[PDB]
Amino acid sequence: DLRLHLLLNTSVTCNDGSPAGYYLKESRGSRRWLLFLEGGWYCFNRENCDSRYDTMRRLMSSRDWPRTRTGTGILSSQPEENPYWWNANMVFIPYCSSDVWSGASSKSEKNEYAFMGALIIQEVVRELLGRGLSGAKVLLLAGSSAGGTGVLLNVDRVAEQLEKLGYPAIQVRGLADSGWFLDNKQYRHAPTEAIRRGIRYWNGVVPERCRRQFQEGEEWNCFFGYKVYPTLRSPVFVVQWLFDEAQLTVDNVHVQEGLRLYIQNLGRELRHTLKDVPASFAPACLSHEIIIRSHWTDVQVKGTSLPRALHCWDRSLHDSTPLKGCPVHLVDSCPWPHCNPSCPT
Ligand SMILES: CC(=O)NCCc1c[nH]c2ccc(O)cc12
Numbered sequence: 426d427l428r429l430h431l432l433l434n435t436s437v438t439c440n441d442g443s444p445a446g447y448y449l450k451e452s453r454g455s456r457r458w459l460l461f462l463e464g465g466w467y468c469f470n471r472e473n474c475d476s477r478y479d480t481m482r483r484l485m486s487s488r489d490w491p492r493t494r495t496g497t498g499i500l501s502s503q504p505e506e507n508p509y510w511w512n513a514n515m516v517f518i519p520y521c522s523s524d525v526w527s528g529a530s531s532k533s534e535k536n537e538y539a540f541m542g543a544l545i546i547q548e549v550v551r552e553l554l555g556r557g558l559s560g561a562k563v564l565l566l567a568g569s570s571a572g573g574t575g576v577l578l579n580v581d582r583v584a585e586q587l588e589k590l591g592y593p594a595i596q597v598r599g600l601a602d603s604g605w606f607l608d609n610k611q612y613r614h615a616p617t618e619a620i621r622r623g624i625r626y627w628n629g630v631v632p633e634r635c636r637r638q639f640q641e642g643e644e645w646n647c648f649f650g651y652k653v654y655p656t657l658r659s660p661v662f663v664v665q666w667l668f669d670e671a672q673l674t675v676d677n678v679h680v681q682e683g684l685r686l687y688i689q690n691l692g693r694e695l696r697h698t699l700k701d702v703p704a705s706f707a708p709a710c711l712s713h714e715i716i717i718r719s720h721w722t723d724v725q726v727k728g729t730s731l732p733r734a735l736h737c738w739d740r741s742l743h744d745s746t747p748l749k750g751c752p753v754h755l756v757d758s759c760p761w762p763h764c765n766p767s768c769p770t
């Protein structure tokens with residue numbers, strides 16, 4: 426089990442001003458550190474956040490967090506469940522800022538809620554340095570759903586923070602699961618407007634190179650993987666279902682020719698956005714399932730599982746071009762959900 430630590434800097438808070446925190450299981454014989462960002466949508470104005478506070482309060486407050494959590498999937502310490510990184514130091518960072526991990530705003534007399542996701546990540550990193558992270562060789566910042574987009578928004582800032590604090594030897598990398606969305610035409614009649622409003626409400630921050638491309642008022646563009654990814658310097662592995670259920674939901678899809686063409690075009694567009702992403706795993710499945718699930722080993726693309734592809738990615742980032750039998754770019758080409766037989770049932 427991973428044990429809860431509330432942040433010692435109690436000014437770095439969840440939405441309601443309670444301290445943020447992290448769950449940690451140390452592995453003293455390992456210099457690998459996995460920091461996982463939880464997902465769970467977001468809220469973008471007072472009324473929308475008030476509703477979330479009533480029925481999704483664990484995503485807005487630490488007051489009711491349990492003392493422990495079990496690590497599952499890529500956070501499992503069992504080699505049978507986690508062939509990739511079972512011996513790593515494991516960190517689960519609860520999502521309690523409702524800001525896609527982008528916020529840097531405290532509660533005040535003008536702000537009913539604090540949106541501090543970007544500061545929570547930096548404070549977790551800072552406090553972990555005293556608990557053994559100072560000796561790391563690899564810090565993998567991973568995350569699912571809103572946490573996957575959170576990886577894209579924060580991985581280079583973690584890399585910058587460690588460099589400025591005096592740790593140039595820690596290799597910071599990202600693993601973005603289920604956070605790679607398209608600002609596409611909806612099937613029926615938006616997220617882009619909700620994100621636009623959210624960024625202003627949260628004082629949301631995006632990576633500097635992406636911000637400089639899109640400029641003031643247009644920071645929402647950097648929440649879309651295919652736009653922010655080319656601006657990132659840290660190595661990032663992208664995991665994305667071609668027919669992601671959150672994508673389809675915001676596209677108002679829940680089969681006649683118009684919908685068939687819509688779904689096929691979505692898969693093709695997703696495939697296209699990954700063509701120049703050398704470390705990626707994109708199965709042709711309709712799913713909301715994420716990499717902290719216990720059976721994450723089961724899905725394969727071209728006969729290669731995700732734990733294998735991640736291992737191949739580790740090999741590709743050794744100090745010493747492609748590896749025989751150890752691929753890292755795995756994108757399905759078949760055009761309909763479950764045309765891959767290994768898709769989750
Ligand atoms: C699902 C969706 O609306 N995607 C478009 C907006 C968007 C970009 N990044 C995100 C991360 C989490 C999330 O809940 C929505 C988004």
Ligand SMILES: CC(=O)NCCc1c[nH]c2ccc(O)cc12
Nearest residue numbers: 607608609610611615616617675
């Ligand atoms: C996921 C999502 O938000 N899609 C909508 C993006 C969007 C906003 N305005 C639009 C106008 C034309 C279009 O082709 C797409 C959009």
Ligand SMILES: *[C@@H]1O[C@H](CO)[C@@H](O)[C@H](O)[C@H]1NC(C)=O
Nearest residue numbers: 434435436437544545547548
């Ligand atoms: C706590 O965090 C805030 C926000 O990052 C920062 O301004 C402040 O200096 C921190 N306090 C201490 C004692 O480090």
